[PDB]
Amino acid sequence: NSTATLCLGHHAVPNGTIVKTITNDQIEVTNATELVQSSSTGEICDSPHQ
Amino acid sequence: NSTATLCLGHHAVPNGTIVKTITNDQIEVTNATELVQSSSTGEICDSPHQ
Amino acid sequence: CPRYVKQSTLKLATGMRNVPEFIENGWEGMVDGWYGFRHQNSEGRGQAADLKSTQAAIDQINGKLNRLIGKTNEKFHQIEKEFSEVEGRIQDLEKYVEDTKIDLWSYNAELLVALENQHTIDLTDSEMNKLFEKTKKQLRENAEDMGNGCFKIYHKCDNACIGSIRNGTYDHDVYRDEALNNRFQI
Amino acid sequence: GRIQDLEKYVEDTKIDLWSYNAELLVALENQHTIDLTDSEMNKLFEKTKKQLRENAEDMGNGCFKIYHKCDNACIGSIRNGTYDHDVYRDEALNNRFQI
């Protein structure tokens, strides 16, 4: 009763994605984005090259 | 009057140069050197190849 | 267009370490900011965000995408890369040139993400340590580290202290003198 | 045509790979160099902190206020890592820590 606990902490999410780093093959982060594009539309669209 | 402020600090310069790092596109340092040679003399010097 | 690589997936981290269970564990309920304060007093438990540290981290993550996304080099007429008939020597060389090139870019892409991803996780961790150290330096002998990122403050405060902490203006010297009675006996 | 296209393609592939290598090389080395220079300062600060004790407090801007009277002799001893804090140290409770 002479104190006031003070916590800083950090955020978290329930769903995470595993990524690779230099020192760890599998570490879960709160969010990730795909860096390799794959499987676009399927038609060769005409613009802007003739 | 019971104390002696003690500061360590670091140096600085008025003129700095912006460089790129892994985590920051633009950070100013006190000095830098160029790693790409450009615009040499204009004469083919005769030594040491024949 | 982006460069062809052999890997089917390469995930670039865009957030901090996930700890699902120093800071002993995450909260999974602070969704309005990246950094913040949790307190316990007579009135309860609460959550808030620190905007300056949040924005500093967010700016850095957007900085990584800007370095990697939409930064490509234009190629037009190249060499043929698929062949319908066996030709031997010249076709072997064209095939060999492409296979060597693909292996070198596939390596570059794998290493690029691994270096950037490791560093990003370290930079998000660094910001937390700086905030902890910054709070520690503002404070003094009025609190003790319990080892899980929280300080027990050995100086009575009633929410006003927390507000002063978030903007770095907390002046500890109000209750500070009764320090020996507080915690340090004989 | 064919043979000249290949020679052109070989050089263009090679130039892109060295241009990438050079850009990344400087970026990796430069980030680490900036980190190593910061590390040496922190180590020096920590080393000074460890030589010292409860006789000073960190104001948060790299400076220590020393809660033990020194008159330049302390500073000289600090630079070569031989400062012996124990001269004024005992009157510590009166200094800073009241009731």
The partner residues of C185 in beta bridges, in order of sequence, read: none
Contact assessment for residue C117 and residue A23, using Cβ atoms and an 8 Å cutoff: no
Backbone angles phi, psi at D17, to 5 degrees: -75, -40
Residue A8: helix, strand or coil by DSSP? coil
Q: What is the resolution of this structure in A?
A: 3.4
B27-29 and B17-19 beta bridge pairing: antiparallel
Minimum-distance CB partner of B6 among D22, D75, D95? D75
Measure the CA angle with vertex B47, ends B42 and B48; round to 5°.
Answer: 135
Round to whole Å and give the CA distance between D78 and D88: 16
Round to whole Å and give the CA distance between C90 and C97: 11
DSSP state of C137: H
Structural domain boundaries enclosing C103: 1-186
DSSP state of C2: P
Contact assessment for residue C164 and residue C173, using Cβ atoms and an 8 Å cutoff: no
Backbone angles phi, psi at C132, to 5 degrees: -60, -45
Experimental method: cryo-EM
Whether B19 and D30 lie within 8 Å, measured CB to CB: yes
Round to whole Å and give the CA distance between B43 and D46: 56
DSSP state of B36: S
One DSSP character per residue, C140-155 reads -TTEEE-SSSEEEESS
Closest CA to D86 of D51, D57, D62: D51
Token digits for D56?
Answer: 């000073």
> In what side-by-side order are the strands of the sheet with B4-7?
B4-7, D63-66, D56-58
DSSP state of C15: S
Token digits for D92?
Answer: 């510590």
Return the half-sphere exposure (C-beta side, CA atoms, 13 A cut-off) of residue C59: 9
- SS3 of chain D: helix, strand, coil, percent, to 5: 60, 5, 30
Token digits for B41?
Answer: 């003399």
Whether C116 and B25 lie within 8 Å, measured CB to CB: no
Whether the link from the prior residue into B48 is cis, omega within 30° of 0, is yes
Whether D97 and C138 lie within 8 Å, measured CB to CB: no
Q: Which contacts qualify for D20-26: CB closer than 8 Å, 24 or more apart?
A: D20/C108, D22/B35, D22/B36, D24/C112, D26/B19, D26/B20, D26/B35
Round to whole Å and give the CA distance between D4 and D15: 17
CB of D36 within 8 Å of a chain C CB? The answer is: no
Question: Which residue type occupies C140?
Answer: R
Q: Number of A:C CB contacts under 8 A? A: 159
R_g of chain D, CA atoms, integer Å: 28
Question: Which residue type occupies A45?
Answer: C
Round to whole Å and give the CA distance between A19 and D16: 27
Question: Which residue type occupies C99?
Answer: D
Measure the CA angle with vertex C170, ends D55 and C156; round to 5°.
Answer: 85
Per the document, the length of chain B is: 50
Helix or strand (DSSP H, E) at B4: strand B4-7
Closest CA to C170 of C184, C158, C183, C182: C158
Angle between helices C89-138 and D2-51 (to 10 degrees): 20
Round to whole Å and give the CA distance between C160 and C170: 9
Q: C60 vs chain B: nearest CA distance in angstroms?
A: 7
Whether B24 and C63 lie within 8 Å, measured CB to CB: yes
Contact assessment for residue C114 and residue C108, using Cβ atoms and an 8 Å cutoff: no
One DSSP character per residue, D46-77 reads HHHHHHS-TTEEE-SSSEEEESS---SHHHHH
CB of C177 within 8 Å of a chain D CB? The answer is: yes
Token digits for C162?
Answer: 């927390």
Round to whole Å and give the CA distance between A21 and C33: 25
H-helix segments, A1-50 = none
Chain C meets chain A (3+ C-beta pairs below 8 A): yes
Round to whole Å and give the CA distance between D30 and D32: 5
How does B20-44 read in b/e, with b if 16+ C-beta sit within 10 Å? ebbbbeeeeeeeeeeeeeeeeeeee
Number of CB atoms found within 10 A of residue C119's CB: 20
Number of domains in chain C: 1
Question: Which residue type occupies A17?
Answer: T
Ramachandran region of residue A11, left (φ > 0), alpha (ψ -120 to 50) or beta? beta
Chain C residue numbers with beta carbons less than 8 Å from the beta carbon of B25 are 63, 66-67
Neighboring chains of C (3 or more beta-carbon pairs < 8 A): A, B, D
DSSP state of C69: T
A17-19 and C11-13 beta bridge pairing: unpaired
Round to whole Å and give the CA distance between C107 and D17: 11
Whether the link from the prior residue into C2 is cis, omega within 30° of 0, is no
Chain C residue numbers with beta carbons less than 8 Å from the beta carbon of A31 are 14-15
Round to whole Å and give the CA distance between C81 and C94: 7
Number of CB atoms found within 10 A of residue C70's CB: 8
DSSP state of B48: S
Return the half-sphere exposure (C-beta side, CA atoms, 13 A cut-off) of residue B24: 14
Token digits for B9?
Answer: 């600090």
C24 CB-near residues (< 8 Å, 6+ apart)? C147, C148, C149
